[PDB]
């Protein structure tokens, strides 16, 4: 910014775009420093009641892998339902 109008007009034209509206250099639009102090929210599990960990510890309630076909009519089954075709976009199908 701080450009004489003519330079701006030359700029906008040569570029073909209103570069003034979206300048790259930042001027007094960037968040001021020393933004106010933050009081962040405490999440769940901070209840002082009905908060038993045994009821909220997925870490080791996990079990050893389930085993099928261990070494020690029927229809065909796929790894999973065949995938669904993606659909062309509607805002900008092409380009």
């Amino acid at each position: 910014a701080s450009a004489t109008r003519v330079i701006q007009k030359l700029r906008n034209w040569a570029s073909g775009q209103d570069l003034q509206a979206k300048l790259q250099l930042r001027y007094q639009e960037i968040a001021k420093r020393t933004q106010p102090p933050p009081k962040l929210p405490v999440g769940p599990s901070h209840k002082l009641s009905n908060n038993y960990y045994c009821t909220r510890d997925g870490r080791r309630e996990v079990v050893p892998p389930s085993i099928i076909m261990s070494s020690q009519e029927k229809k065909a089954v796929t790894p999973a339902p065949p995938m669904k075709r993606w659909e062309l976009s509607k805002d900008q199908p092409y380009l």
């Binding site: 070494s71 009519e73 029927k74 229809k75 065909a76 065949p82 995938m83």
Partner: protein, 112 residues
């Protein structure tokens, strides 16, 4: 009819229904040698028979593409002959046989 398939390398196959019917019928034939109760024969015969039946039943390729999935019809052709190749390969491999060898003991115990 279409101009080209999304996939770069694949090229539009005219007479796609005929090309599929040729490949599908071939596979069914090769499978005819597999042992009778061989798992691959029963499973793939079921899949291939359903695929043909649909190819025979549908005269519109766009709906054919919907009925057996496969995205573009050209891909289904590639998948069918790829399967035809493996069917020939497995007959040589004889994988329907029992396990080649039991794993050394404690071979599959992860906590270790």
């Amino acid at each position: 009819l279409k101009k080209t398939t999304g996939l770069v390398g694949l090229a539009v196959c005219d007479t796609p229904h005929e090309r599929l019917t040729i490949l599908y019928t071939k596979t069914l034939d090769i499978l005819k040698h597999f042992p009778k109760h061989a798992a691959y024969r029963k499973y793939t015969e079921q899949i291939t028979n359903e695929k043909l039946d649909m190819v025979k039943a549908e005269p519109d390729v766009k709906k054919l593409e919907a009925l057996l999935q496969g995205g573009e019809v050209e891909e289904v052709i590639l998948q069918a002959e790829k399967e035809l190749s493996l069917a020939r390969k497995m007959l040589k491999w004889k994988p329907w046989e029992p396990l080649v060898e039991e794993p050394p003991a404690n071979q599959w115990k992860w906590p270790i």
